[PDB]
Amino acid sequence: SGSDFLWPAPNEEQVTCLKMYFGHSSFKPVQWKVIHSVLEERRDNVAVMATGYGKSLCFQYPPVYVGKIGLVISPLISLMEDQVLQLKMSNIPACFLGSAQSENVLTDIKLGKYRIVYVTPEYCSGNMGLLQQLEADIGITLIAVDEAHCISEWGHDFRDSFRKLGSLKTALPMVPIVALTATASSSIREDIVRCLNLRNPQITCTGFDRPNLYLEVRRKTGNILQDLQPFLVHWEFEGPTIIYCPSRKMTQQVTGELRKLNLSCGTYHAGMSFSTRKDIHHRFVRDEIQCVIATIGINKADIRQVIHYGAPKDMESYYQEIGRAGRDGLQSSCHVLWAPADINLNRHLLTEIRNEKFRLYKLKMMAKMEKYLHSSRCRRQIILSHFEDKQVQKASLGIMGTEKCCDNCRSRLDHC
């Protein structure tokens, strides 16, 4: 599935380059997001990959595709040497530039015969003029900064050699920087953005299996209150709850039905003003309202229940929307209530799209969402297979296959 579930769609030359130089058949969603932002928007990136794997493609692919140069700053010397070896095994010219390197290799770099150049932060801070000449003559596709959290003095593994990296954006303001890390700390990420002088960067955070989230899919009965009664205990939810609806009309229907039971809840849609949405968010965090019925950023630490009333839009929005739950690490649940006649499964609503690539993309996303909803397989396995590479999937242990994972694992443990 090279360009199946990705928008903008990777063109056929890009898929060819991927298959031929990296041996992969498709881009993972976050990989394509980073690569496309770098290639088309020249935009800085802060990329958190929780498990640590799956970040090599993000900074190796763009300079190979465009045929220019890519700089990789890292302190992990043995890893950089192994990656140089692996790249040269794939007919990708790459080298680990340092102080003890021949001027033959240096002029080869200046002539643009190396696709990827690995350097230490010390050497990088010691030779900014070389980097500027490389940008002027060849053109630097991106500058990757691995272990970027080391630039934060507030973190555990601060390295002084990262400090001077603050000058990069000063000397090459048009060259995008891709700062990669494995920590999800918001303050660490703010420090990375600040010290690297990044300009409105795209921030991605992926690589989780979220063991504290239980997944389940149920069919609608047609009656809103009958559908939502199992989530209630005068009447109230078991905890702070978000209900995602596909439209504002269904949002209002659900809100009125819940308020028939004197439930403390509030609506959250784009048709309201900024102040009203901020007030609803503040009252949700303060627990004055127990439930938010929304059509989509709701940031709250102790969300115990997410309910999609209706089939979600696609796997990406569903991913982002159930990710809001259980941020405190405590047990939470994510239920989808769906029916084949739901709006987000209506292909007739796509017949008017003019861009044929976009029409195919919408059809593919709709079909994949329906196949997830109808599947008897492990929901978490489906999500991780769609979003993460195999190495990230295998790093997940302790949740998949247990009765706290999803409804299908639970049914396969119970009598069949």
User: Which residue ranges are tagged as binding site for ATP?
Assistant: 24, 26, 28, 31, 52
Of the two residues 186 and 247, which places its CB atom closer to ligand A1CA4 in the complex?
Answer: 186
Annotated binding site for Zn(2+): 378, 405-406, 409
- Binding annotation: 24, 26, 28, 31, 52, 378, 405-406, 409
Q: Does 210 bind Zn ion (CB under 5 A)?
A: no
What CA–CA distance (Å, rounded) separates 118 from 127? 13
Q: With respect to Zn ion, which residue has the nearer C-beta, 9 or 392?
A: 392
- Does position 158 bind ligand A1CA4 by CB under 6 A? no
Give yes or no for a contact between 286 and 273, defined as CB atoms under 8 angstroms apart.
no
Measured from each CB, the residue nearest to ligand A1CA4 is: 323
Instruction: Determine if 395 is a binding residue for ligand A1CA4 (CB under 6 A).
Output: no
Q: If binding is defined by CB under 6 A, does position 327 make contact with ligand A1CA4?
A: yes
Q: Does position 217 bind Zn ion by CB under 5 A?
A: no
Amino acid at 24: H
Residues 6 or more apart from 74 whose CB is under 8 A from it? 80, 118, 120, 121, 144, 145, 146, 147
- H helices of 165-267, in order, are 168-171, 186-195, 224-228, 248-259
Question: Could you tell which of Zn ion, ligand A1CA4, none binds residue 189, using a CB distance below 5 to 8 A set by kind?
Answer: none
Q: Where are the beta strands (DSSP E) in 86-229?
A: 94-96, 116-119, 140-145, 177-181, 202-206, 213-219
Contacts of residue 164, defined as CB under 8 A and 6 or more positions apart, other chains included, come to 121, 125
What are the distances in angstroms from CA 7 to CA 197, 235, 365? 29, 43, 10
Cβ closest to ligand A1CA4, residue 14 vs residue 206: 206
Q: Identify residues 353-382 at the interface with Zn ion (CB under 5 A).
A: 378, 380
Is residue 33 within the footprint of ligand A1CA4 (CB under 6 A)?
yes
DSSP state of 40: I
3-class state of residue 44 by DSSP: coil
- What is the CA 307 to chain-centroid distance, rounded? 21
Query: Contacting ligand A1CA4 (CB under 6 A), which of 79, 184, 261, 395?
Result: 184
Q: How far is the CB of 399 from Zn ion (least distance, A)?
A: 8
Closer residue to ligand A1CA4, CB minimum distance, 15 or 205 = 205
The closest alpha carbon to 242, from 316, 318, 293, 310, belongs to: 293
The one of ligand A1CA4, Zn ion, none whose footprint includes residue 358, by CB under 5 to 8 A per kind, is none
Written as six digits, the tokens of 265 are 């809840």
Residue 323 sits in the site that holds ligand A1CA4 (CB under 6 A): yes
Shortest CB 396 distance to ligand A1CA4, Å: 8
CA nearest 402: which of 394, 390, 410? 410
By CB under 6 A, tell whether 55 contacts ligand A1CA4. Answer: no
204 binds ligand A1CA4 (CB under 6 A): yes
- The entry of ligand A1CA4, Zn ion, none near residue 30 (CB within 5 to 8 angstroms by kind) is ligand A1CA4
Question: What backbone torsions phi and psi does residue 387 show, to the nearest 5 degrees?
Answer: -100, -30
User: Of these, 162, 208, 268, 309, which contacts ligand A1CA4 (CB under 6 A)?
Assistant: 208
C-alpha closest to that of 298 among 266, 330, 337, 331: 266
* Residues found near Zn ion in the complex (CB under 5 A): 378, 380, 405-406, 409
Contact residues toward ligand A1CA4 (CB under 6 A) are: 29-30, 33, 184, 203-206, 208-210, 213, 316, 319-320, 322-324, 327, 380, 383
